[PDB]
Design an enzyme around this catalytic site. Structure first.
Site, PDB file in Angstrom:
ATOM      1  N   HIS A  55      -4.505   5.458   6.873  1.00  0.00           N
ATOM      2  CA  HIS A  55      -3.699   6.204   5.906  1.00  0.00           C
ATOM      3  C   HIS A  55      -2.207   6.193   6.227  1.00  0.00           C
ATOM      4  O   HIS A  55      -1.447   7.017   5.708  1.00  0.00           O
ATOM      5  CB  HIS A  55      -4.211   7.639   5.755  1.00  0.00           C
ATOM      6  CG  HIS A  55      -5.681   7.709   5.485  1.00  0.00           C
ATOM      7  ND1 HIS A  55      -6.223   7.463   4.241  1.00  0.00           N
ATOM      8  CD2 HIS A  55      -6.727   7.958   6.308  1.00  0.00           C
ATOM      9  CE1 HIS A  55      -7.538   7.565   4.309  1.00  0.00           C
ATOM     10  NE2 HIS A  55      -7.869   7.867   5.552  1.00  0.00           N
ATOM     11  N   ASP A  78      -2.063   0.314   6.760  1.00  0.00           N
ATOM     12  CA  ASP A  78      -3.003  -0.153   5.753  1.00  0.00           C
ATOM     13  C   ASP A  78      -2.665  -1.585   5.345  1.00  0.00           C
ATOM     14  O   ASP A  78      -3.560  -2.430   5.232  1.00  0.00           O
ATOM     15  CB  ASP A  78      -3.007   0.804   4.555  1.00  0.00           C
ATOM     16  CG  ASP A  78      -3.778   2.098   4.831  1.00  0.00           C
ATOM     17  OD1 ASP A  78      -4.474   2.176   5.866  1.00  0.00           O
ATOM     18  OD2 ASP A  78      -3.688   3.048   4.017  1.00  0.00           O
ATOM     19  N   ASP A 126      -2.438   1.285  -6.867  1.00  0.00           N
ATOM     20  CA  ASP A 126      -1.005   1.225  -6.555  1.00  0.00           C
ATOM     21  C   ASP A 126      -0.175   0.735  -7.738  1.00  0.00           C
ATOM     22  O   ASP A 126       0.810   1.375  -8.130  1.00  0.00           O
ATOM     23  CB  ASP A 126      -0.779   0.324  -5.341  1.00  0.00           C
ATOM     24  CG  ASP A 126      -1.523   0.813  -4.133  1.00  0.00           C
ATOM     25  OD1 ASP A 126      -0.869   1.344  -3.216  1.00  0.00           O
ATOM     26  OD2 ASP A 126      -2.771   0.699  -4.119  1.00  0.00           O
ATOM     27  N   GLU A 169       1.971   5.153   0.170  1.00  0.00           N
ATOM     28  CA  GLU A 169       1.514   6.523   0.354  1.00  0.00           C
ATOM     29  C   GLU A 169       2.299   7.407  -0.601  1.00  0.00           C
ATOM     30  O   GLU A 169       3.429   7.086  -0.973  1.00  0.00           O
ATOM     31  CB  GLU A 169       1.671   7.031   1.785  1.00  0.00           C
ATOM     32  CG  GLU A 169       0.971   6.203   2.845  1.00  0.00           C
ATOM     33  CD  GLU A 169      -0.521   6.100   2.663  1.00  0.00           C
ATOM     34  OE1 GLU A 169      -1.153   7.070   2.176  1.00  0.00           O
ATOM     35  OE2 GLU A 169      -1.068   5.046   3.048  1.00  0.00           O
ATOM     36  N   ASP A 221       0.868  -1.177   0.000  1.00  0.00           N
ATOM     37  CA  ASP A 221       0.000   0.000   0.000  1.00  0.00           C
ATOM     38  C   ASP A 221       0.901   1.221   0.000  1.00  0.00           C
ATOM     39  O   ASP A 221       1.509   1.509   1.024  1.00  0.00           O
ATOM     40  CB  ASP A 221      -0.915   0.018   1.221  1.00  0.00           C
ATOM     41  CG  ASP A 221      -1.943   1.133   1.158  1.00  0.00           C
ATOM     42  OD1 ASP A 221      -2.883   0.996   0.357  1.00  0.00           O
ATOM     43  OD2 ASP A 221      -1.818   2.139   1.893  1.00  0.00           O
TER      44      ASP A 221
HETATM   45  N1  LIG Z   1      -8.806  12.044   0.658  1.00  0.00           N
HETATM   46  C1  LIG Z   1      -7.701  12.167  -0.120  1.00  0.00           C
HETATM   47  N2  LIG Z   1      -7.398  13.331  -0.724  1.00  0.00           N
HETATM   48  C2  LIG Z   1      -6.307  13.479  -1.490  1.00  0.00           C
HETATM   49  N3  LIG Z   1      -5.442  12.484  -1.722  1.00  0.00           N
HETATM   50  C3  LIG Z   1      -5.619  11.263  -1.177  1.00  0.00           C
HETATM   51  C4  LIG Z   1      -6.788  11.025  -0.328  1.00  0.00           C
HETATM   52  N4  LIG Z   1      -6.722   9.744   0.093  1.00  0.00           N
HETATM   53  C5  LIG Z   1      -5.603   9.198  -0.460  1.00  0.00           C
HETATM   54  N5  LIG Z   1      -4.955  10.110  -1.226  1.00  0.00           N
HETATM   55  C6  LIG Z   1      -3.686   9.887  -1.939  1.00  0.00           C
HETATM   56  O1  LIG Z   1      -3.605   8.518  -2.266  1.00  0.00           O
HETATM   57  C7  LIG Z   1      -2.520   7.890  -1.527  1.00  0.00           C
HETATM   58  C8  LIG Z   1      -2.909   6.478  -1.147  1.00  0.00           C
HETATM   59  O2  LIG Z   1      -3.990   6.459  -0.222  1.00  0.00           O
HETATM   60  P1  LIG Z   1      -4.742   5.104   0.166  1.00  0.00           P
HETATM   61  O3  LIG Z   1      -5.199   4.516  -1.157  1.00  0.00           O
HETATM   62  O4  LIG Z   1      -5.846   5.615   1.066  1.00  0.00           O
HETATM   63  O5  LIG Z   1      -3.761   4.237   0.890  1.00  0.00           O
HETATM   64  C9  LIG Z   1      -2.244   8.854  -0.382  1.00  0.00           C
HETATM   65  O6  LIG Z   1      -0.932   8.713   0.167  1.00  0.00           O
HETATM   66  C10 LIG Z   1      -2.495  10.211  -1.032  1.00  0.00           C
HETATM   67  O7  LIG Z   1      -1.393  10.589  -1.849  1.00  0.00           O
HETATM   68 MN   LIG Z   2      -2.787   3.881   2.509  1.00  0.00          MN
HETATM   69 MN   LIG Z   3      -4.037   2.565  -0.656  1.00  0.00          MN
END
Ligand SMILES: Nc1ncnc2c1ncn2[C@@H]1O[C@H](COP(=O)(O)O)[C@@H](O)[C@H]1O
Ligand SMILES: [Mn+2]
Ligand SMILES: [Mn+2]
Length: 200
Positions: free
Chosen positions: A172, A177, A114, A17, A15
Site C-alpha cells: 500500500h 506497489d 487508477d 494512493e 499506482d
Molecule cells: N482496505 C481499504 N479501505 C479503504 N480504502 C482503501 C483500501 N485499500 C485501498 N484503498 C484506497 O484505494 C487507494 C489505492 O489502493 P491500492 O489500489 O491498494 O493501491 C488507497 O490509497 C486508498 O485511498
Molecule cells: Mn497502492
Molecule cells: Mn492500486
C-alpha cells in the site's frame, strides 16, 4: 520464447494512493503519484517519476489513511496540488522522450481503478482535461489472467503468490506497489507473454 519482442518501447507502471477513511471519504483525492518507466523488452526500470500531492477538499489525512498508506501529513504539506503535479508529469514525459508519436508506450496498473475511476473523476471535479496518454492502459490482473489462465483473487499479493515472488517493499505504498507490478511484468515476459492494451 523468453523475453519476446513487445508491442511497446516502454511500459509506464502507475499506482496512485489517495485520501481515504472508514467508511470511505468523499471525494477521494490523489496523494501519491508514481510512474516507473520500464524498458519495453527487458522490463527493467530505467526512470522514476514520484511526487506526493497536496489534497485540497479534505486537506488533513485521516488516521486510517496514514495507517493504510504510511503517508504522514508532512509528506503532503507544502506539496503541489494535482493540477501542478500533472504538469510536472507532462514535463517528465517530454524529457523521457515519451511524447514522440514514434515512441510507443502505455500505462500499466493493478486493476482499472487508477485511470478509469480515480484520475478522470478528480480531473472532472477540478475541471481539468485528462492528458491523452492516460486514456489507454493495461490492467495487470487481466494480463495475468491471460498469461496464467487464472483470475487472481487479491491483486499484487496473489499474483506474487502464483509466481513465487517475494513482495518488494511495503504494501500500500504507491511506489512499492509499482515495483511489484514491474517485477510481476518481468516474470510474465520471462515466461513468454506479450502484453496488450486492455482498456476499452
Ligand atoms: N482496505 C481499504 N479501505 C479503504 N480504502 C482503501 C483500501 N485499500 C485501498 N484503498 C484506497 O484505494 C487507494 C489505492 O489502493 P491500492 O489500489 O491498494 O493501491 C488507497 O490509497 C486508498 O485511498
Ligand atoms: Mn497502492
Ligand atoms: Mn492500486
Amino acid at each position: 520464447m523468453s523475453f519476446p519482442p513487445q508491442r511497446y518501447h516502454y511500459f509506464l507502471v502507475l499506482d496512485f494512493e489517495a485520501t481515504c477513511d472508514k467508511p470511505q471519504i468523499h471525494p477521494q483525492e490523489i496523494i501519491e503519484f508514481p510512474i516507473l518507466k520500464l524498458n519495453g523488452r527487458t522490463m527493467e526500470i530505467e526512470s522514476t517519476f514520484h511526487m506526493y500531492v497536496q489534497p485540497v477538499v479534505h486537506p488533513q489525512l485521516t488516521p486510517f489513511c496514514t495507517e493504510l498508506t504510511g503517508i504522514i501529513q508532512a509528506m503532503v504539506d507544502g506539496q503541489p496540488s494535482l493540477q501542478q503535479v500533472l504538469e510536472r508529469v507532462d514535463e517528465w514525459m517530454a524529457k523521457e522522450g515519451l511524447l514522440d508519436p514514434n515512441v510507443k508506450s502505455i500505462f500499466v496498473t493493478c486493476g482499472d481503478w487508477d485511470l478509469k475511476v480515480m484520475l478522470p473523476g478528480q480531473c472532472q471535479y477540478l475541471g481539468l482535461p485528462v492528458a491523452d496518454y492516460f486514456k489507454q492502459w493495461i490492467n495487470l490482473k487481466k494480463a495475468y489472467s491471460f498469461a496464467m489462465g487464472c483470475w487472481p483473487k487479491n491483486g499484487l499479493l496473489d499474483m506474487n503468490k502464483g509466481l513465487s515472488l517475494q513482495h518488494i517493499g511495503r504494501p500500500h505504498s504507491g511506489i512499492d506497489d509499482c515495483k511489484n507490478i514491474a517485477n510481476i511484468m518481468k516474470t510474465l515476459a520471462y515466461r513468454g507473454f506479450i502484453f496488450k492494451q486492455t482498456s476499452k
